[PDB]
Short mmCIF file of all heavy atoms in Angstrom, two decimals:
data_model
loop_
_atom_site.label_atom_id
_atom_site.label_comp_id
_atom_site.label_asym_id
_atom_site.label_seq_id
_atom_site.Cartn_x
_atom_site.Cartn_y
_atom_site.Cartn_z
N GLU O 224 86.87 101.31 92.71
CA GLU O 224 86.66 100.90 91.31
C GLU O 224 87.93 100.27 90.74
O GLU O 224 89.04 100.63 91.21
CB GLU O 224 86.27 102.15 90.47
CG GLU O 224 84.77 102.55 90.60
CD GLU O 224 83.86 101.45 90.09
OE1 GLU O 224 83.94 101.17 88.89
OE2 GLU O 224 83.15 100.83 90.90
N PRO O 225 87.83 99.40 89.69
CA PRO O 225 89.03 98.80 89.04
C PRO O 225 90.04 99.88 88.63
O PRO O 225 89.66 100.91 88.05
CB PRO O 225 88.45 98.20 87.78
CG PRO O 225 87.03 97.82 88.23
CD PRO O 225 86.59 98.94 89.07
N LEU O 226 91.32 99.68 88.96
CA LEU O 226 92.32 100.69 88.71
C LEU O 226 92.56 100.82 87.21
O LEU O 226 92.36 99.85 86.47
CB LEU O 226 93.64 100.39 89.45
CG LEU O 226 93.52 100.30 90.96
CD1 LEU O 226 94.82 99.95 91.60
CD2 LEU O 226 92.99 101.60 91.49
N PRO O 227 92.94 102.06 86.75
CA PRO O 227 93.29 102.33 85.37
C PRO O 227 94.66 101.76 84.94
O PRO O 227 95.60 101.72 85.76
CB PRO O 227 93.30 103.87 85.32
CG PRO O 227 93.74 104.27 86.69
CD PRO O 227 93.03 103.28 87.59
N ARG O 228 94.77 101.34 83.69
CA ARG O 228 96.04 100.81 83.15
C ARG O 228 96.96 101.90 82.55
O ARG O 228 98.18 101.71 82.52
CB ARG O 228 95.83 99.68 82.12
CG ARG O 228 95.13 98.44 82.68
CD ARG O 228 94.87 97.41 81.61
NE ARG O 228 93.88 96.40 82.05
CZ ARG O 228 94.16 95.22 82.64
NH1 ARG O 228 95.43 94.86 82.89
NH2 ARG O 228 93.15 94.44 82.96
N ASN O 229 96.34 102.99 82.08
CA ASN O 229 96.98 104.16 81.47
C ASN O 229 96.02 105.35 81.38
O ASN O 229 94.90 105.28 81.90
CB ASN O 229 97.50 103.86 80.06
CG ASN O 229 96.48 103.11 79.21
OD1 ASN O 229 95.30 103.44 79.18
ND2 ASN O 229 96.94 102.07 78.52
N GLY O 230 96.43 106.43 80.73
CA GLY O 230 95.56 107.59 80.61
C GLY O 230 95.60 108.52 81.81
O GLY O 230 96.50 108.42 82.65
N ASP O 231 94.67 109.44 81.87
CA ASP O 231 94.76 110.56 82.80
C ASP O 231 94.56 110.17 84.28
O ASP O 231 95.25 110.70 85.14
CB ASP O 231 93.81 111.78 82.34
N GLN O 232 93.65 109.22 84.55
CA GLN O 232 93.45 108.67 85.90
C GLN O 232 94.70 107.94 86.45
O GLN O 232 95.00 108.03 87.66
CB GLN O 232 92.22 107.75 85.96
N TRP O 233 95.40 107.22 85.58
CA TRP O 233 96.68 106.64 85.90
C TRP O 233 97.71 107.65 86.45
O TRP O 233 98.24 107.43 87.56
CB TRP O 233 97.26 105.86 84.72
CG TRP O 233 98.39 104.94 85.06
CD1 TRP O 233 98.34 103.60 85.39
CD2 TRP O 233 99.79 105.31 85.13
NE1 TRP O 233 99.60 103.12 85.66
CE2 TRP O 233 100.53 104.13 85.50
CE3 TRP O 233 100.50 106.50 84.94
CZ2 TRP O 233 101.94 104.11 85.63
CZ3 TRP O 233 101.93 106.49 85.08
CH2 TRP O 233 102.61 105.28 85.45
N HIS O 234 97.98 108.69 85.67
CA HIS O 234 98.86 109.81 86.07
C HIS O 234 98.42 110.58 87.29
O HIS O 234 99.25 110.99 88.10
CB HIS O 234 99.09 110.76 84.88
CG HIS O 234 99.83 110.15 83.74
ND1 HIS O 234 101.19 109.90 83.77
CD2 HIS O 234 99.39 109.68 82.54
CE1 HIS O 234 101.56 109.33 82.64
NE2 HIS O 234 100.49 109.19 81.87
N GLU O 235 97.12 110.77 87.48
CA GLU O 235 96.60 111.43 88.67
C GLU O 235 96.94 110.63 89.97
O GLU O 235 97.28 111.24 90.98
CB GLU O 235 95.09 111.70 88.52
CG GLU O 235 94.52 112.83 89.42
CD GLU O 235 94.89 114.27 88.98
OE1 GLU O 235 96.05 114.74 89.20
OE2 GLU O 235 94.01 114.94 88.43
N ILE O 236 96.90 109.28 89.94
CA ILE O 236 97.30 108.48 91.11
C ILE O 236 98.81 108.66 91.40
O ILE O 236 99.21 108.89 92.54
CB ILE O 236 96.92 106.96 90.96
CG1 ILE O 236 95.43 106.82 90.69
CG2 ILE O 236 97.46 106.13 92.12
CD1 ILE O 236 95.03 105.46 90.12
N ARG O 237 99.63 108.55 90.35
CA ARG O 237 101.10 108.73 90.39
C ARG O 237 101.49 110.20 90.81
O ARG O 237 102.58 110.45 91.27
CB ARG O 237 101.67 108.39 89.01
CG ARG O 237 102.24 107.00 88.77
CD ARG O 237 101.54 105.70 89.20
NE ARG O 237 100.20 105.47 88.73
CZ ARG O 237 99.56 104.29 88.60
NH1 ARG O 237 100.11 103.11 88.85
NH2 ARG O 237 98.31 104.33 88.23
N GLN O 238 100.61 111.14 90.71
CA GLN O 238 100.84 112.38 91.40
C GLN O 238 100.60 112.33 92.93
O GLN O 238 100.74 113.31 93.60
CB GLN O 238 100.07 113.55 90.69
CG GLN O 238 100.79 114.09 89.43
CD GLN O 238 102.01 114.99 89.79
OE1 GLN O 238 101.87 116.05 90.44
NE2 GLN O 238 103.22 114.57 89.37
N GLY O 239 100.25 111.17 93.49
CA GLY O 239 100.06 111.02 94.92
C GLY O 239 98.64 111.15 95.40
O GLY O 239 98.41 111.39 96.59
N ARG O 240 97.67 111.02 94.51
CA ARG O 240 96.23 111.14 94.88
C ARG O 240 95.50 109.78 94.94
O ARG O 240 95.41 109.10 93.92
CB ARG O 240 95.51 112.11 93.85
N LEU O 241 94.93 109.41 96.11
CA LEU O 241 94.23 108.14 96.31
C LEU O 241 92.98 108.00 95.44
O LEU O 241 92.23 108.93 95.37
CB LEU O 241 93.78 107.89 97.78
CG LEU O 241 94.87 107.87 98.85
CD1 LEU O 241 94.22 107.93 100.23
CD2 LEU O 241 95.76 106.73 98.78
N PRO O 242 92.77 106.80 94.82
CA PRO O 242 91.46 106.58 94.15
C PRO O 242 90.30 106.75 95.15
O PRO O 242 90.51 106.70 96.38
CB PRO O 242 91.59 105.13 93.65
CG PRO O 242 93.15 104.97 93.45
CD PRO O 242 93.70 105.65 94.67
N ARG O 243 89.09 107.02 94.68
CA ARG O 243 87.91 107.12 95.58
C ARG O 243 87.65 105.80 96.25
O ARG O 243 87.70 104.75 95.59
CB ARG O 243 86.65 107.47 94.80
CG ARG O 243 85.50 107.76 95.68
CD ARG O 243 84.21 108.10 94.89
NE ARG O 243 83.29 106.98 95.10
CZ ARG O 243 82.73 106.72 96.27
NH1 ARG O 243 82.97 107.51 97.33
NH2 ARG O 243 81.94 105.68 96.40
N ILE O 244 87.45 105.86 97.58
CA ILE O 244 87.14 104.69 98.46
C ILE O 244 85.71 104.88 98.94
O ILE O 244 85.40 105.92 99.53
CB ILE O 244 88.24 104.52 99.66
CG1 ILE O 244 89.61 104.15 99.08
CG2 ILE O 244 87.81 103.43 100.67
CD1 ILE O 244 90.88 104.41 100.03
N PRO O 245 84.81 103.88 98.67
CA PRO O 245 83.40 104.03 99.00
C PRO O 245 83.07 103.70 100.47
O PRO O 245 82.10 102.98 100.72
CB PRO O 245 82.77 102.93 98.11
CG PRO O 245 83.83 101.80 98.19
CD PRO O 245 85.10 102.57 98.03
N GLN O 246 83.88 104.17 101.42
CA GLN O 246 83.71 103.95 102.87
C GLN O 246 84.57 104.98 103.65
O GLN O 246 85.55 105.50 103.12
CB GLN O 246 84.07 102.48 103.30
CG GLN O 246 85.54 102.05 103.26
CD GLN O 246 85.68 100.63 103.80
OE1 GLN O 246 85.19 100.32 104.90
NE2 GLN O 246 86.25 99.75 102.99
N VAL O 247 84.15 105.30 104.87
CA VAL O 247 84.82 106.32 105.66
C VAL O 247 85.98 105.65 106.36
O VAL O 247 85.79 104.74 107.15
CB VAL O 247 83.86 106.93 106.70
CG1 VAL O 247 84.56 108.04 107.54
CG2 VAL O 247 82.57 107.51 106.04
N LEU O 248 87.21 106.15 106.09
CA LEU O 248 88.38 105.67 106.82
C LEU O 248 88.91 106.75 107.79
O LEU O 248 88.72 107.94 107.55
CB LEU O 248 89.47 105.16 105.82
CG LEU O 248 89.13 103.96 104.84
CD1 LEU O 248 90.25 103.60 103.86
CD2 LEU O 248 88.76 102.71 105.62
N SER O 249 89.55 106.37 108.89
CA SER O 249 90.23 107.34 109.75
C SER O 249 91.20 108.17 108.90
O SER O 249 91.75 107.65 107.93
CB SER O 249 90.90 106.70 110.97
OG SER O 249 92.01 105.87 110.56
N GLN O 250 91.29 109.46 109.18
CA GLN O 250 92.28 110.37 108.62
C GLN O 250 93.70 109.81 108.72
O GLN O 250 94.50 109.94 107.78
CB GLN O 250 92.18 111.75 109.29
CG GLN O 250 90.90 112.53 108.93
CD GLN O 250 90.83 113.95 109.53
OE1 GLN O 250 91.36 114.21 110.65
NE2 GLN O 250 90.18 114.87 108.81
N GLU O 251 94.05 109.22 109.86
CA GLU O 251 95.40 108.70 110.01
C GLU O 251 95.64 107.59 109.00
O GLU O 251 96.78 107.50 108.42
CB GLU O 251 95.66 108.24 111.48
N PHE O 252 94.63 106.73 108.79
CA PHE O 252 94.79 105.53 107.96
C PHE O 252 94.93 105.99 106.50
O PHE O 252 95.88 105.65 105.82
CB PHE O 252 93.65 104.50 108.14
CG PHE O 252 93.87 103.25 107.35
CD1 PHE O 252 95.11 102.62 107.36
CD2 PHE O 252 92.86 102.69 106.56
CE1 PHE O 252 95.35 101.50 106.65
CE2 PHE O 252 93.12 101.49 105.81
CZ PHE O 252 94.35 100.91 105.87
N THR O 253 94.02 106.82 106.11
CA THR O 253 94.05 107.49 104.82
C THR O 253 95.35 108.25 104.50
O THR O 253 95.84 108.09 103.39
CB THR O 253 92.81 108.43 104.76
OG1 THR O 253 91.66 107.61 104.66
CG2 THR O 253 92.86 109.32 103.55
N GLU O 254 95.88 109.02 105.47
CA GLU O 254 97.21 109.64 105.39
C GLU O 254 98.31 108.62 105.14
O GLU O 254 99.26 108.91 104.38
CB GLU O 254 97.58 110.44 106.69
CG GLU O 254 96.67 111.77 107.01
CD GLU O 254 96.86 112.36 108.51
OE1 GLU O 254 98.03 112.42 108.99
OE2 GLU O 254 95.85 112.78 109.20
N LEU O 255 98.25 107.45 105.81
CA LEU O 255 99.29 106.47 105.63
C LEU O 255 99.23 105.85 104.22
O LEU O 255 100.22 105.79 103.57
CB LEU O 255 99.29 105.38 106.73
CG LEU O 255 100.15 104.09 106.47
CD1 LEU O 255 101.62 104.39 106.31
CD2 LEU O 255 99.93 103.14 107.61
N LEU O 256 98.07 105.44 103.76
CA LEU O 256 97.87 105.07 102.34
C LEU O 256 98.44 106.11 101.33
O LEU O 256 99.03 105.75 100.31
CB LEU O 256 96.39 104.77 102.06
CG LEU O 256 95.82 103.56 102.79
CD1 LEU O 256 94.32 103.35 102.36
CD2 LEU O 256 96.62 102.27 102.54
N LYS O 257 98.21 107.39 101.60
CA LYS O 257 98.58 108.46 100.70
C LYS O 257 100.06 108.69 100.65
O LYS O 257 100.64 108.94 99.57
CB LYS O 257 97.90 109.74 101.14
CG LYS O 257 97.85 110.83 100.11
CD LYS O 257 96.72 111.79 100.44
CE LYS O 257 95.31 111.18 99.97
NZ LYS O 257 94.03 111.89 100.46
N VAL O 258 100.68 108.64 101.84
CA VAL O 258 102.09 108.66 101.90
C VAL O 258 102.75 107.46 101.16
O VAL O 258 103.85 107.63 100.57
CB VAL O 258 102.65 109.06 103.32
CG1 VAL O 258 102.76 107.87 104.31
CG2 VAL O 258 103.99 109.76 103.14
N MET O 259 102.12 106.28 101.18
CA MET O 259 102.57 105.08 100.47
C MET O 259 102.57 105.21 98.95
O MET O 259 103.28 104.49 98.27
CB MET O 259 101.80 103.86 100.89
CG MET O 259 102.17 103.37 102.32
SD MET O 259 101.03 102.12 102.86
CE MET O 259 101.65 100.67 102.05
N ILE O 260 101.79 106.14 98.43
CA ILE O 260 101.80 106.40 96.95
C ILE O 260 102.45 107.79 96.61
O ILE O 260 102.29 108.32 95.48
CB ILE O 260 100.33 106.23 96.30
CG1 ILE O 260 99.35 107.24 96.88
CG2 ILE O 260 99.84 104.80 96.41
CD1 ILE O 260 98.06 107.51 96.11
N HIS O 261 103.19 108.37 97.56
CA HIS O 261 103.86 109.64 97.30
C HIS O 261 104.75 109.59 96.05
O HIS O 261 105.51 108.61 95.89
CB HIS O 261 104.74 110.04 98.49
CG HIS O 261 105.03 111.49 98.50
ND1 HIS O 261 106.02 112.07 97.73
CD2 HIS O 261 104.45 112.52 99.19
CE1 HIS O 261 106.05 113.38 97.94
NE2 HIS O 261 105.10 113.68 98.80
N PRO O 262 104.65 110.61 95.13
CA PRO O 262 105.53 110.69 93.94
C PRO O 262 107.02 110.53 94.19
O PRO O 262 107.71 109.97 93.34
CB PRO O 262 105.21 112.06 93.30
CG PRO O 262 104.23 112.69 94.12
CD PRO O 262 103.65 111.68 95.10
N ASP O 263 107.52 111.05 95.32
CA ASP O 263 108.91 110.86 95.73
C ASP O 263 109.03 109.53 96.48
O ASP O 263 108.53 109.39 97.61
CB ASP O 263 109.39 112.00 96.62
CG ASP O 263 110.82 111.79 97.13
OD1 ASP O 263 111.47 110.76 96.79
OD2 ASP O 263 111.30 112.68 97.89
N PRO O 264 109.70 108.53 95.87
CA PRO O 264 109.65 107.27 96.53
C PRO O 264 110.39 107.26 97.86
O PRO O 264 110.16 106.31 98.61
CB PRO O 264 110.30 106.28 95.52
CG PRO O 264 111.11 107.11 94.64
CD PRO O 264 110.47 108.45 94.60
N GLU O 265 111.28 108.26 98.12
CA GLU O 265 112.03 108.35 99.40
C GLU O 265 111.10 108.74 100.55
O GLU O 265 111.43 108.59 101.73
CB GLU O 265 113.14 109.41 99.35
CG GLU O 265 114.26 109.17 98.32
CD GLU O 265 115.62 109.81 98.66
OE1 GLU O 265 115.73 110.80 99.44
OE2 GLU O 265 116.64 109.29 98.15
#
């Protein structure tokens, strides 16, 4: 879905949580996306 500009959904992503994806991805692929939005940029 279109990403949020602000509000509670915005902050939930910045806590390191991937938006809902309407298709099955490999766990490894999904893990790599999730690590790419980790709150600690290091």
Side-chain angles (χ1 to χ4, degrees), residues 224-230 233-239 241-250 252-265:
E224 280 297 295
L226 301 178
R228 298 177 196 267
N229 46 44
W233 194 93
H234 295 285
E235 203 74 283
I236 304 163
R237 264 45 57 158
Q238 279 285 298
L241 302 167
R243 187 181 111 69
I244 294 160
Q246 70 177 308
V247 181
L248 299 177
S249 67
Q250 290 184 328
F252 185 45
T253 289
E254 295 166 42
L255 166 61
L256 295 182
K257 197 158 280 170
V258 85
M259 287 170 80
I260 61 162
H261 201 279
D263 177 1
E265 297 206 337

